[PDB]
Amino acid sequence: YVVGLQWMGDNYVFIEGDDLVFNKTTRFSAADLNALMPEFPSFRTLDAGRGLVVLFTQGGLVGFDMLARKVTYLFDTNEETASLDFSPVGDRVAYVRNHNLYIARGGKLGEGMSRAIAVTIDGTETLVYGQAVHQREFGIEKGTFWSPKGSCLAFYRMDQSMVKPTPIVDYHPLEAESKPLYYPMAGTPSHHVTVGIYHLATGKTVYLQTGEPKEKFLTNLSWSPDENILYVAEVNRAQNECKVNAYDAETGRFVRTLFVETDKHYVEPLHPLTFLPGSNNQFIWQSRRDGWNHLYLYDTTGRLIRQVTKGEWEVTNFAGFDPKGTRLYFESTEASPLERHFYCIDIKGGKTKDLTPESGMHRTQLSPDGSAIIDIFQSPTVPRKVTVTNIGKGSHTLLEAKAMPEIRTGTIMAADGQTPLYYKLTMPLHFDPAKKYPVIVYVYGGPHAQLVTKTWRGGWDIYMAQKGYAVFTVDSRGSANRGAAFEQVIHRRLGQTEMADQMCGVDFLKSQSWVDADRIGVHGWSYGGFMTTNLMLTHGDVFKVGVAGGPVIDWNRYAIMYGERYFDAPQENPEGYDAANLLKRAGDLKGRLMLIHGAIDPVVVWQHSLLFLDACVKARTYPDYYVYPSHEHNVMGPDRVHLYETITRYFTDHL
Amino acid sequence: YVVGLQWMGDNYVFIEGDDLVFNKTTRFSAADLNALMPEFPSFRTLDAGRGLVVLFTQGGLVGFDMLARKVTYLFDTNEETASLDFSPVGDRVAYVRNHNLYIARGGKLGEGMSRAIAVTIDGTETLVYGQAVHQREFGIEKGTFWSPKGSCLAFYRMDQSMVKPTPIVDYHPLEAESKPLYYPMAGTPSHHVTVGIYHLATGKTVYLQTGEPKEKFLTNLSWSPDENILYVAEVNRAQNECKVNAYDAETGRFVRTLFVETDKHYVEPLHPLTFLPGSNNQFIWQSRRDGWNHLYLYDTTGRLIRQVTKGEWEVTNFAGFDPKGTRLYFESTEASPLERHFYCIDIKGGKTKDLTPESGMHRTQLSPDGSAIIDIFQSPTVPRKVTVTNIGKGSHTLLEAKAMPEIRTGTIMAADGQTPLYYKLTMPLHFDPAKKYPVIVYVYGGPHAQLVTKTWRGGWDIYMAQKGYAVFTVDSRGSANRGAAFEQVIHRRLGQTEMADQMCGVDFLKSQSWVDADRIGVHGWSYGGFMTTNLMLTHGDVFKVGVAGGPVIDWNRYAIMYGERYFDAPQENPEGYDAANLLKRAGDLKGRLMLIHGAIDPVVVWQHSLLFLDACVKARTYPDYYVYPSHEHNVMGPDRVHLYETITRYFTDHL
């Protein structure tokens, strides 16, 4: 590891416990910095180009210019840190505190402080401001969006007063305390999001006139460079139409629909418009419309200039432009879906140039000037290789790293007999081919994830293998980075294809002489917990033992914005929902299955596993259980040791 | 079984599927009865003397005179059945519906109906009328108390707005729904109960002027025969003082304190004043003041005439008087604490006469005229023997009943080396003395219960024994029907003596050659779940495997009215509470323990077991779990099969 490796101006920078080291060598010490403070530490980089960061300290935030080596501003956000969103000007920060949105202005060293401005005053339990909405679907990670010159702050306003909440119970007080979680379930009334724009110069707020239906999803907010227009990708409840619309930032009025995308199954916008350098009129839009995620060049009237990238592979990260905006830089699966390389392509399209040719996983940062890249590489044979490259040519290696369980990899055919699936197999520690071994299928299988890549490597497979158990994983159809067709086969039919493909994995395991076919188990979390449970109920003669963590059990109880994409609405798809409703098949549990839930899980509500145990009571079947009362969806931190030991012992006891 | 065996007038009565049979023989058929209905079934007897019952039917209640064979009244209680309390006059019924107390008047066959009267109108979530209060401690089972001539209805009013509630979550709706349970925990603010009296003739309500502290416990409401005075046994928060006070029923004014009882540890009134036949001036009061529950004769000024019963044994049921009120009839432990016999004693005291001399458990009903008794008897050798006796002499036997696991019984010394404890031991099915067997201690050990009596017989011990496991139970000190000294040793020190005595049980088991000393387990529910868990943590080298159902884990989270009696308040007793707080010792769990909870348990809140699992996470120890989301404190009905199989398999898997 090379702590905090990143660009600052035209220098690449990393920490050495005490120093921050710059190269294009200069060195900046924690004591040098400490001397400059008002009253090597951790920081958040605000502006890589300018090397502007913020330092989290006792009594407030200190902005710091690492290139000038000078304090910029002190910020007082009343101890709020989670929702911090600094203006691109660097001298103001937005945050949410006790339900409301505020802007705090930075104070110059010893020039006194100003009281923060309240953008909103009526925030409440059912009226949420400046936070993520739509259950963080559609790439939404926050609810504040500064205009690029800092003149305005756009923000979400989510009225969830029509959403029927779920109790989230804190068991630690003397008497347990419940708080409502406004988690909108499939087929129910959604929340109503609108977008406000607060104009800093006048203190006026205008709301975008997004109109009806009020449930429409307002995603990928993207400001025009000149701050006159705020663009929004609006998605309908069916999730088969996305309209990219322009709104006037001064009045909130609708201006025009630039373009509309539609899909047989679903459209899923995940990334904002990105304007070309120096341009207010041209932008890149990511779209999976042709079956593969690609980069499209548009003007602001909505006219498509050209598809810039194309091929039966997907762009997985858009990194930006050359200064002239004549080239695009991005990460993609072009080399292989099991790999990630960094590429250059002419804005006019045509041939990609792979800038990180070595076979495996590259994670790459383009410098602020667009002239160089930091590259961090790993492969099954290479633990870590850190390169810095002046784009054509001159690569400089900065770092290279050099009984454990054997990992085997390969391909099997999916249940269609045509589609190749990639698998990884962690062999028992000290594996002996003369011996028979139990094996656990570790499954996820849900959209957006891909578990099998050409990496060096959260190590539960290795722990299990150390206890003498092989662990097998296969990326079944439904999984990611293989194009839309490979994913969308699951539409309206969750579990069906996924399980058919996982059984192809089992066919492969049973073809291995060293596999004890009577000692096959299964483990997964979330979609993986749904899959674990579904496989035990559906293939109960095969799967002897399973452990299902935070499992989805009834998709009618999953959040609207995720579940209705892949499954449609419960009213539109009773047959598909019914087939995946594991409560209806609890009587088919004939093996040993432990369900595990964090009690305060806001992703898969606790009710899922509790109702399964309830269904098993009625059906006279006999699962086991563990609850982590202090944890949300996943068990995080040191308690993860307890989790691994609980899961592992369940398998060593019963499988 | 002889279905519904009871007195009606001077006849004893029982059902024969179709007939109701009377003897002093007459027979009354379901078709005879059905012909008399407006528009053999189940009924509730209202007045045994008059043979007046009520029949629960589609569309309302039908009162019926079984001696006259005539319908009395039809009652419309808007489908409320749980809270029904019929006037002793027989023609009105009180009940609680949607928070409020009502009186419905019976309607004579085809004479039309009248609308019920609302006694209260402001009942609410935090203001409870006509229901049990004080967590059903102090013998409180209901919240309505008719005056003996039906002129007035006294009732509880419980303001619980100062009690911090616990969430009880219903998981069955689409989104789970929480309702607050106003369960007042040890050391916290209690609810405020007052007593209203509704006068039927005037429609006026007066409240007793019970005064301060408002938290005082108002128990064992008892009307004077002439309806002028309502007596109340008031208990202080410390539970070491009980004042029996007279209040004027017309005005609610305090009249006088008749007598006060105090105790080093606690006083616990459990039974109402019972007036002598034909007397407004003399009554029997039950009291454990001398160390043993006995019957005391008082006048209404509060002057004690005499202790009527005395001895180192306890009255366990007061059955009533001879018509003249010169004799008392009651059940007691005089023969043996392992037995129950029915006795006569002169009101002047002196020598008891045992009316049911045969060694074992007699359950006896004195006839309305006090001249005869129905007796139902069982012993280890006698399954069921049903006698009817004209009191001296002439006993008439009405019924007598005649590989399973062997049950052994005996005595061991408690940890004091002095006090005898009685045990029962269910031997493995097909027990072989040459063999070694695992054994499970089934423990309760809490106050008010006594698990080892001289009976024929809920059969979990037998099921376990059928799986090859011996089950042992011993009534340790703290348990019931052995006098106050035997019970009160636990005061301020819950678990300590109880466990010392249970370990004497283990010493005894280890002295048996056929006991595998390395395969000892433990199971119990409620106080028994606390004891199971405490024994595993305290004696982890002995108890390999346990299953603890609805367990108390932190006594600070038990209800005030029970916990503060035995433990004092948390602020008064940090050392004792701390020693019993199983959350503090979760790191001592080194065996296999499954905790089981009903999610909607209003007795031991679910939080107890959840916090233990939480404590085990932090302590890195590894319990197992099951939750019955649809069940309260105990699993009832068919689902009890699932429970037994879950508990049994835990032991057959791990012990």
Swiss-Prot record, chains A, B:
GO terms for biological process: proteolysis. Keywords: Aminopeptidase, Hydrolase, Protease, Serine protease, Signal. It comes from the Bacteria. The active site is at S526, D601, H633. The N-terminus is blocked. Stable for at least 12 hours at 25 or 37 degrees Celsius (at pH 7.6). Its EC number is 3.4.14.12. GO terms for molecular function: aminopeptidase activity; dipeptidyl-peptidase activity; serine-type peptidase activity. Strongly inhibited by diisopropyl fluorophosphate and Pefabloc. Weakly inhibited by 3,4-dichloroisocumarin. Not inhibited by phenylmethylsulfonyl fluoride, leupeptin, antipain or prolinal. Activated by iodoacetamide. InterPro entries: AB_hydrolase_fold, Peptidase_S9_cat, Peptidase_S9B_N, Serine_Prot_S9B/DPPIV. It catalyses: Hydrolysis of Xaa-Xaa-Pro-|-Yaa- releasing the N-terminal tripeptide of a peptide with Pro as the third residue (position P1) and where Yaa is not proline. It holds the Pfam family DPPIV_N. Optimum pH is 6-8. Coiled coil: none annotated. Belongs to the peptidase S9B family. Serine proteinase. Releases tripeptides from the free amino terminus of proteins. Has a requirement for Pro in the P1 position, but is inactivated by Pro in the P1' position. This is Prolyl tripeptidyl peptidase. It comes from Porphyromonas gingivalis (strain ATCC BAA-308 / W83).
